[PDB]
Amino acid sequence: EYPTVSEIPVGEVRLYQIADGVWSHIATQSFDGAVYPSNGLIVRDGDELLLIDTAWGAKNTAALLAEIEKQIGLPVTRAVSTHFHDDRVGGVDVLRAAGVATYASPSTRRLAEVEGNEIPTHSLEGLSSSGDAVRFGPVELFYPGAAHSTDNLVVYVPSASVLYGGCAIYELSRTSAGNVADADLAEWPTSIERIQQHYPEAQFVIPGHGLPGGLDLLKHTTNVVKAHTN
Ligand SMILES: [Zn+2]
Ligand SMILES: [Zn+2]
């Protein structure tokens, strides 16, 4: 039932209704020989839509907007990128040209700039310290500390108890660590624990890539990060 790379051909995007006014957007990516699904989030904010992360790149993101415009019909007015990597900010220029107001922490914007990636226009203050949380429309933005990246943020939708971890949280099918070049392996577990202590009520946990699950994805991720560290 949850879209997999089997139901989504490269360059296309599919939306999945997780709860009322809450969706995940799935896009198939092709990287270094393999193909895999990438998850994003969409949260109804009144009569508008809040988008969490791009679909990696201009084309895919443009396809994302198109799939939203026809399946949902509400205007995407704001967007938040969970970290500076190209798969999460790539497509921001497209979002900006469509009238979407793009956001990201100063930390993320700084890192994207240094990396030469697209840069969300607006800045999200109040998230520079581990454990920081701020309300942003229908969701709560949370910085658990360095993990997959030193700037990664996780998103929680209180009304639906949906937690989007971005690449900070792995799916069960992932047995080994992914790209940990810019990750803080030493802090990742402690950051996961902060996520656990802040959202003990989460019912649906969405990993950066793959099938959603429950809060056990946190421990899974921790198990995988631990093993990699050793
Ligand atoms: Zn990344
Ligand atoms: Zn603006």
Side-chain angles (χ1 to χ4, degrees):
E1 179 199 54
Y2 192 82
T4 71
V5 297
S6 296
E7 298 71 63
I8 310 178
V10 178
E12 292 201 59
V13 180
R14 300 291 172 271
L15 309 182
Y16 184 76
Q17 267 264 183
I18 301 166
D20 193 46
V22 184
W23 303 256
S24 70
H25 64 83
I26 309 80
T28 304
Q29 311 304 325
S30 173
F31 171 95
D32 176 59
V35 155
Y36 72 84
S38 181
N39 295 312
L41 205 74
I42 303 168
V43 191
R44 185 173 189 164
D45 175 29
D47 291 316
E48 322 184 321
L49 295 173
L50 167 63
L51 171 63
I52 306 301
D53 290 325
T54 65
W56 191 354
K59 198 293 177 60
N60 289 1
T61 301
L64 166 58
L65 294 182
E67 186 68 6
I68 290 175
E69 186 171 63
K70 188 54 171 297
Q71 295 296 91
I72 308 180
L74 271 358
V76 176
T77 66
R78 297 184 298 183
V80 170
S81 286
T82 48
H83 74 277
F84 78 104
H85 285 165
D86 186 54
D87 65 311
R88 299 307 182 176
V89 290
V92 151
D93 289 352
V94 156
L95 293 179
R96 182 184 300 97
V100 185
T102 61
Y103 291 78
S105 70
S107 174
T108 296
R109 300 184 68 260
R110 170 189 309 137
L111 284 172
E113 178 176 290
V114 172
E115 203 69 5
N117 295 341
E118 294 173 54
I119 304 158
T121 295
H122 288 274
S123 305
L124 295 170
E125 298 187 305
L127 295 165
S128 60
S129 191
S130 299
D132 280 331
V134 306
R135 181 247 231 283
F136 200 72
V139 312
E140 180 174 75
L141 303 179
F142 187 66
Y143 173 53
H148 170 83
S149 61
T150 63
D151 64 312
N152 56 210
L153 293 179
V154 297
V155 183
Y156 186 66
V157 187
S159 70
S161 299
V162 174
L163 175 65
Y164 169 59
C167 296
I169 297 175
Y170 297 155
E171 74 174 304
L172 296 178
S173 295
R174 176 164 293 172
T175 68
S176 61
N179 166 56
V180 293
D182 305 321
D184 185 313
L185 303 174
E187 291 302 317
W188 204 322
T190 300
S191 296
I192 288 292
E193 181 67 25
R194 291 200 188 80
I195 296 175
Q196 168 58 65
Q197 293 309 319
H198 211 85
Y199 303 110
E201 76 281 39
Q203 293 303 298
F204 298 64
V205 183
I206 301 178
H209 306 338
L211 304 177
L215 270 170
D216 53 352
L217 285 189
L218 302 191
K219 186 62 179 188
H220 170 69
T221 300
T222 284
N223 289 339
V224 177
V225 173
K226 290 296 209 309
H228 179 273
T229 299
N230 298 338

